[PDB]
C-alpha cells in the first residue's frame, strides 16, 4: 500500500 508522512 502507499504510505504518507507529513512532519
Ligand atoms: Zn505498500
Known amino acids: ?3 504518507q ?3
Do not use: H, L, P
Request: glycine share 16%; aromatic share 16%; charged share 0%.
Open 1 to 3: 500500500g502507499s504510505n
Open 5 to 7: 508522512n507529513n512532519f
